[PDB]
Write a protein that binds this ligand. Structure first.
Ligand code: ADP
Ligand code: ADP
Ligand code: ADP
Lengths: 232, 67, 449, 441, 36, 439, 66
């Protein structure tokens, strides 16, 4: 709450409120000097004193939240709180130690937005590529990736990765999702595992437990099985 | 409760998928604060004060004392 | 995951017609108390209550507070329930009637919608513009700024008061820091360096967040659960705003003060103004005063005027005393410690002792609650101790007898483990017998009488 | 909404006639008590007179015979004009201050000063605002407003444009520019610009344009007590103390000077003194150190009339050891004048239960009302008045409309009256902790 | 070319202090041997 | 040094059967109470069962505090163990009930785990830009290991730590990036011969290898009382050391309990329940028991172990007596463990342990006489006689103590059994409840 | 040496049109009124005024607690 004030309808009451409840002498004494006063005290020919000789506000004894009560969702409690993301955090630290620019593929790109926030947060240089970017921007940002050896993580739509794009400079794959068609998943894998591929690219398919993506994994695996036995 | 809200069947299956992915896609509260007891000044609209606006310290208590 | 003394209680266990069915949802028996507690619960959930007295009599070890946890788990999460004791109100800062009224207004809740007006941007240009400052001692004073906020879709270039500048200045906002100015108080929390200034070669351990998407002048509604005592503390010691009383008032140490009658009436009128605008919803609750006989006569005097208020929660008193002397004046004896004038407000609920089979059922429920399985002869042994010694003594002979069972490689508890734990761990009666017998004379091997 | 039905929400005044002072037996809630209500009527008519000191009337009587009822009747039969202050006599034993001074503040809270002075206000919908901030600043601007009748243009000073961007006055607000100070209280929003408001809720109230002229003078009447002025003139910004209780021992020269300036305000005709009522509930909870101050605070010109209520018979006085009638010393019982009440006849019990039933809106069969009167003969008013609220809910258990005998006999079965509770304590001695012993079956 | 900041840099050889030219006329150059 | 409970090195029971050994780890000479305390220790180490009450009753000088210190040495420095005495609660700052609530909440540890980021390497150059007469600071730090060569930036606090540490060129420092401390480990070059006020030549360390940004996972254990104090005050921190905490309202505790439950569910924190030991609980009055009986009702209550000395005593603040000075509505909740007075063949080996702890050598005749004295005056006189006879044997230059030294110490320092007779003989030159005379 | 601003004079009233001051008329008396006042002071008021700063410049008292 703000402190209680007096509703008295004279001008003198307003002047006394703005001279007691605010009282600019104490504010000047507490926060410090005006930068104009700093300039006239530091370009003069002789040393001169300052009436707040330093900023007399005490140093707050809690670094993340000082003198307010405002709460930002903390980064660990913000987007982390998921095991997929937790193991992804571990393996992204591991591949940073490995020094390999990897990938993402996902179905619903709002997850890709929230992962963008996570990766800007934990300081990883990244690039984004969905269907929403125009075609010249698509080819130019994938060219800018494939010419630069340092930008560390992609963002892609899984199904719209089935273009004629080139990812030889990529060297590792992470699927955050395992949805129905194996040929889309293997097609994006082929978009990594290209004809110009130099080294072994490993692919990490993140799996939960007891949940529906294991079902989709099994169903897709059976469909892959029938496909491969028929046209082998 | 639905075999016997937000009851779409693909809300069911693909939100099983989403809650594999990340829970905050299903709606999350934005950055909070404590409740405020006093009387501020509400902005009228967004399409009037275009670029050069001035904030005013409008914080008064609803508790008044009339003299 | 810690089994306390009250873990098996999950509610009163009532039928649809309000009839207590025994051995249901934790309790065993105790019909005439649980039906009356169900009546009290539906008196709470009907909001025709402005102070009713409900006394829970009965001897110690008969489940007075088990009914209280049953009520507190039957009302729900969104109804206020304030449990205190009779020894909690003797404070050293304020008079104890202030602590009573603070508990009475802890027990009344309010659900309020609020519309916060954030300005969530990234600071582009920060430039102060001081005003005229003649010879008045303090010197120059910054009076106007030109902070430019840059969101994702449409920037804005706004002008500030001195006080919101001091709110910025006590947050150490440089150029590049994303903030959101809260134009209700004036507060403004720095979030971090924007990712356009990102560099992995850094040392300050800053939190890099991206540019906040959306309009720079957002407006968002939230729901808040605030009791009336929270409003009392908020208007009593101000800690919001950017003036001097509300800034030098959060560096001092916080002290409980005596919120007077006038503030407690003005906040009632403010809350009625909220309700008449169709925003806030009032939800009254329960003050559970356990061990009411520790309150002295100066508190039962003030409970009369505290219950005569047009807004006052329902009081549930517990008192395990017979004919006893009131703490304040030592020359009038009465039942329960309650004075004979205050006792007429109360709807007195009795509580009767147990039976040698109800003790067996409580022992079985407590054993399957803690996680200690055992045999029926051991259950009969513990029920024999329950009939002879006490009720809440025989429940406590299950926790060593598990451990001793795990000493001997067993899983279930047999007769030998309880026959050993009854010798290692004693009750109060046999200890007093050993005390009187062995402690014959004071001396070297005696007791200090 | 904060009008929950209490134990005294049915009293709408003292109920007596104001022409011949006859206590008509059933009016405004107070039903049955005749001689005590006539004496309270006499006291009430000499309070509004003002030409008497602070005197002392002691409402003595047995428990639950309508003493707080008569006091609340006198509280409702004065309005918000003459200051009535309740004081349960355990708010005095504080630790922020002493005890005699805490009593002195309760005397000073009940002597109002009523002064009436004028202000000049402006109603009206803002048609449009133009502010010449062009780098410029708050220098000049035009304000066009209207009522249903008027319409006007004003030019604004710098210290008014800084109050217009302070309250953010839109094009369509219903504001009240207090001209003498400059504060702006937006009374609401005009309906005719409902399209022009985007940053509002979906459910938002809208008013009409104010009717009448646009520049009018209000004769507001304020009334503040002497304790208000005492706490104001005690610190730098000290009125916060009377909202937070952090006032301490106020020095007596301040009270003496304010007692002088109130007399100088009265003699100049600028003011008017209104003596209030102070109700000291449960006056037996004071020690003799209090009575040795109430015996002299009831002596000055500025002293409110004290009304007070005692339950005890021949009891001890706190602080001392010797007994006395009503718990009060005899040198203080010389000051007071005593009104005695009486227990209630059963037909009066029946119609008091009828009023308490009609207050909560609970339907009763006359057989259940006869049974409830029979219970109230043997267990008092408070027990039956709680059995009403219990029996409505028990009838609402089994989906009934009117309560009957089959629900009053359940409420009498579950919730014991205190006589049977005393019998329960007397017949369950060995397990209830009397003073020493606990026996477990 | 900073207006009012005085540099201190300490390397493996030694440690020197640079002063901007704009501060030599001021009172800050009295220690450094410029003065008013 | 050697206090009165320094010889104890735990409780001294088995790990598989918890049988009381007759002579093991100091606590020698009692079997029933040590076995029962082993059972209590095992259900504390389980951590599941919350809100019990153990009352170690018995005659004085029988080793109750010895059993308490045996459980204290047996838990180690992991689980909190508050050694509260019953007279500390009667404060004048805060209320009598809130001191008990703080005494309960000091014994529930919260063990959190957080990642810090530590640096390592040799400082190559410092670059500090300072204003004139108040102002901000700028900082560039070039640091090099054997592999990387980084040019980091600095803020105001980092420069305020650098100038406090006086970090010159050629120092092996390690900066925690989160907390912001600077610990110089040494140097790689030598001291320069150009400046005077340089300092002291530190340890000669080589250039560290590896990487700059290394991560570390540290474990921090705070009691709930520290969380209450740091979340009850806006700026007034450090009042959890100087005891300036006036009152914590219940709105703060009912939020911190919920947040600790949420931290328990998220895998952030772990609740380690602890032991609240209350020494000589008979001094508390009934206003304390009427809260102690109800604080043992929640999931966040510690397993209370407490001692007593008294027989049928009157409870303070009341007018009536009870066994142990404790009320019979509170004695239902507790579980009483008795202790017995000792036997001389146990007093012999207890005095042997106390003699071997204080480094005192004896003769068996002196030990027999000492046991004969300890039969009649307890251990509390005999141990003082041990130390006193050691120093009297040191005064007359003897190797081992003898019968004459023990007789000398028995002649000089009275046991209480003779001081009572000394009071009862000369009653006219001692101030009783009456007057006194002078010869 | 005590000064109070009573208000803005009504000759400069309608300079602007919605200024916010207290417009009062020019006093129709003397400019130099000379009157004498006998007035008492108790010694306790001297004691309090010499011990602690009172009323005028005691602005830190608006906190209240200590
Ligand atoms: N009806 C019941 N069913 C199960 N347990 C009970 C019942 N009544 C009492 N208890 C047990 O008695 C113990 C103490 O009850 P409590 O309410 O603390 O006694 P008191 O009424 O003296 O406060 C509790 O641990 C509870 O488990
Ligand atoms: N004349 C009356 N008319 C209506 N209700 C009455 C009357 N007298 C007493 N009552 C009721 O009886 C109850 C007891 O009155 P009260 O003055 O509170 O008793 P006590 O004097 O013991 O405080 C009150 O709740 C009031 O509603
Ligand atoms: N069983 C024991 N083992 C080891 N030392 C003991 C034993 N019993 C007593 N002592 C010693 O005797 C002294 C008294 O024990 P303590 O617990 O202080 O007695 P009390 O319980 O009366 O306070 C302690 O210093 C302890 O070293």
């Amino acid at each position: 709450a703000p402190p209680i004030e007096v509703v008295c309808d004279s001008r003198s009451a307003v002047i006394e409120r703005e001279n007691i409840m605010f009282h600019p002498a104490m504010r000047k004494a507490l926060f410090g000097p005006t930068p104009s006063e700093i300039k006239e005290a530091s370009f003069g020919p002789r040393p001169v004193t300052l009436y707040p000789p330093r900023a007399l506000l005490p140093a707050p004894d809690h670094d993340k939240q000082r003198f307010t009560n405002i709460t930002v969702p903390s980064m660990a409690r913000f987007v982390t709180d998921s095991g997929k993301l937790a193991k992804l955090d571990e393996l992204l630290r591991e591949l940073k130690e490995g020094g390999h620019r990897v990938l993402l593929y996902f179905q619903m790109t709002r997850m890709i937005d929230l992962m963008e926030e996570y990766l800007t947060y934990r300081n990883y240089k990244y690039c984004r590529l969905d269907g929403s970017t125009k075609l010249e921007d698509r080819r130019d940002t994938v060219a800018d990736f494939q010419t630069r050896p340092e930008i560390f993580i992609f963002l892609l739509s899984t199904r719209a990765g089935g273009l004629g794009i080139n990812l030889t400079t990529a060297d590792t794959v992470i699927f955050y999702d395992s949805d129905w068609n194996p040929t889309i998943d293997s097609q994006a894998m082929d978009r990594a595992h290209r004809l110009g591929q130099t080294k072994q690219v490993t692919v990490y398919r993140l799996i939960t437990r007891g949940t529906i993506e294991e079902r989709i994994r099994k169903r897709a695996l059976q469909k892959e099985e029938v496909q491969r036995v028929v046209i082998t | 409760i639905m075999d016997l809200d937000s009851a779409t069947l693909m809300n069911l299956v693909m939100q099983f998928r989403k809650v594999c992915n990340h829970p905050d896609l299903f709606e999350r509260a934005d950055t909070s604060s404590p409740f405020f007891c006093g009387h501020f000044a509400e902005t009228g609209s967004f399409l009037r004060e275009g670029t050069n606006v001035a904030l005013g310290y409008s914080t008064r208590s609803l508790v008044e004392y009339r003299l | 995951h810690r089994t306390a003394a009250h873990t098996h209680i999950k509610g009163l266990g009532l039928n649809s017609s309000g009839i207590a069915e025994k051995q249901a949802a934790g309790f065993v028996g105790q019909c005439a108390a649980r039906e009356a507690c169900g009546v009290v619960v539906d008196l709470i959930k009907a909001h025709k209550m402005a102070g009713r007295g409900v006394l829970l009599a009965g001897g110690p070890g008969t489940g007075k507070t088990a009914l209280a946890l049953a009520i507190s788990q039957e009302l729900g999460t969104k109804i206020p329930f304030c449990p205190i004791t009779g020894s909690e109100i003797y404070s050293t800062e304020v008079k104890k009637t202030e602590v009573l009224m603070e508990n009475f207004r802890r027990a009344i809740g309010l659900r309020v919608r609020e519309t916060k007006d954030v300005y969530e941007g990234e600071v582009t240009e920060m430039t102060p513009e001081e005003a005229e400052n003649p010879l008045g001692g303090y010197g120059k004073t910054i009076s106007t700024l030109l902070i430019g906020l840059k969101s994702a879709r449409g920037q804005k270039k706004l002008r500030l008061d001195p006080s919101i500048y001091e709110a910025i200045q006590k947050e150490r906002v440089q150029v590049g820091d994303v903030i959101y100015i809260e134009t209700n108080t004036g507060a403004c929390k720095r979030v971090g360096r924007s990712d356009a200034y990102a560099t992995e070669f850094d040392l300050e351990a800053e939190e890099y967040v991206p540019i906040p998407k959306g309009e720079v002048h957002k407006k968002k509604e939230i729901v808040q659960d605030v009791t009336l005592h929270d409003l009392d503390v908020a208007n009593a010691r101000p800690q919001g705003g950017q003036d001097i009383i509300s800034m030098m008032g959060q560096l001092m140490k916080p002290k409980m003060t005596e919120i007077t009658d006038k503030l407690r009436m003005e906040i009632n009128k403010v809350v009625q103004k909220y309700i008449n605008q169709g925003v806030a919803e009032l939800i009254p609750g329960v003050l559970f005063i356990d061990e009411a006989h520790m309150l002295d006569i100066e508190c039962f005097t003030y409970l009369n005027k505290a219950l005569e208020s047009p807004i006052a929660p329902i009081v549930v008193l517990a008192s395990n005393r017979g004919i006893a002397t009131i703490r304040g004046a030592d020359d009038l004896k009465a039942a329960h410690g309650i004075p004979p004038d205050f006792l007429q407000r109360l709807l007195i609920i009795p509580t009767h002792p147990y039976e040698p089979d109800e003790i067996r059922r409580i022992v079985r429920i407590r054993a399957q609650t803690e996680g200690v399985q055992l045999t029926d002869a051991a259950v009969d042994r513990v029920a024999e101790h329950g009939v002879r010694i006490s009720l809440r003594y025989c429940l406590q002979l299950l926790a060593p007898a598990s451990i001793l069972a795990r000493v001997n490689g067993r899983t279930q508890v047999d007769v030998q483990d309880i026959a050993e734990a009854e010798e290692l761990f004693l009750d109060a009666r046999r200890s007093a017998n050993i005390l009187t017998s062995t402690g014959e004379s004071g001396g070297l091997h005696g007791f200090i009488s | 909404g904060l009008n929950l039905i209490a134990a005294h929400s049915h009293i709408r005044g003292l109920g007596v006639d104001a022409d011949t002072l006859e206590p008509r037996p059933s009016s405004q809630g107070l039903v049955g008590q005749e001689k005590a209500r006539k004496a309270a009527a006499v006291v009430l008519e000499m309070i509004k007179q003002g030409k008497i000191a602070g005197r002392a009337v002691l409402i003595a009587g047995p428990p639950s015979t309508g003493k707080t009822a008569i006091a609340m009747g006198m509280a409702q039969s004065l309005g918000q004009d003459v200051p009535f202050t309740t004081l349960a006599a355990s708010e005095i034993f504080s630790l922020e201050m002493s005890k005699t001074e805490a009593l002195t503040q309760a005397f000073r809270k009940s002597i109002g000063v009523r002064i009436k002075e004028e202000s000049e206000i402006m109603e009206g919908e803002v048609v449009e605002i133009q502010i010449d901030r062009s780098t410029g600043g708050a220098k000049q601007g035009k304000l066009t407003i209207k009522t249903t009748d008027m319409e006007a243009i004003y030019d604004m000073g710098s210290k008014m444009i800084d109050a217009m961007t302070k309250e953010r006055v839109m094009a369509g607000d219903i504001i009240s520019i207090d001209k003498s100070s400059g504060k702006i209280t937006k009374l609401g929003r005009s309906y005719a610009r409902s399209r022009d408001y985007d940053a509002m809720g979906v459910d938002t109230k809208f008013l009409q344009c104010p009717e009448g002229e646009l520049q009018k003078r209000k004769e507001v009447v304020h009334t503040v007590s002497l304790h208000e002025i005492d706490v104001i003139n005690s610190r730098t910004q000290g009125f916060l103390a009377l909202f937070s209780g952090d006032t301490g021992e106020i020095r007596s020269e301040i009270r003496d000077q304010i007692n002088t300036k109130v007399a100088e305000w009265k003699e100049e005709g600028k003011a008017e003194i209104v003596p209030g009522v102070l109700f000291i509930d449960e006056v037996h909870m004071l020690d003799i150190e209090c009575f040795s101050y109430i015996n002299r605070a009831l002596e000055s010109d500025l002293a409110p009339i004290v009304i007070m209520a005692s339950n005890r018979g021949v009891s001890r006085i706190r602080g001392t050891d010797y007994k006395s009638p009503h718990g009060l010393p005899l040198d203080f019982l010389d000051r007071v004048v005593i009104i005695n009440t009486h227990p209630y006849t059963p037909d009066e019990l029946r119609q008091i239960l009828s009023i308490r039933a009609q207050e909560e809106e609970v339907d009763l069969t006359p057989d259940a009302l006869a049974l409830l009167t029979k219970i109230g003969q043997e267990a008092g008013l408070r027990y039956a008045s709680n059995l009403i609220t219990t029996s409505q809910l028990i009838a609402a258990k089994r989906r009934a409309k009117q309560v009957g005998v089959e629900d009053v006999q359940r409420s009498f079965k579950l919730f014991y009256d205190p006589a049977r509770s005393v019998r329960f304590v007397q017949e369950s001695e060995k397990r209830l902790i009397g003073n020493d012993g606990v026996v477990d079956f | 070319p900073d207006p009012m900041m005085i540099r201190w840099v300490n390397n493996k050889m030694g440690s020197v202090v640079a002063v901007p030219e704009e501060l030599l006329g001021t009172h800050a150059g009295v220690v450094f041997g410029a003065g008013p």
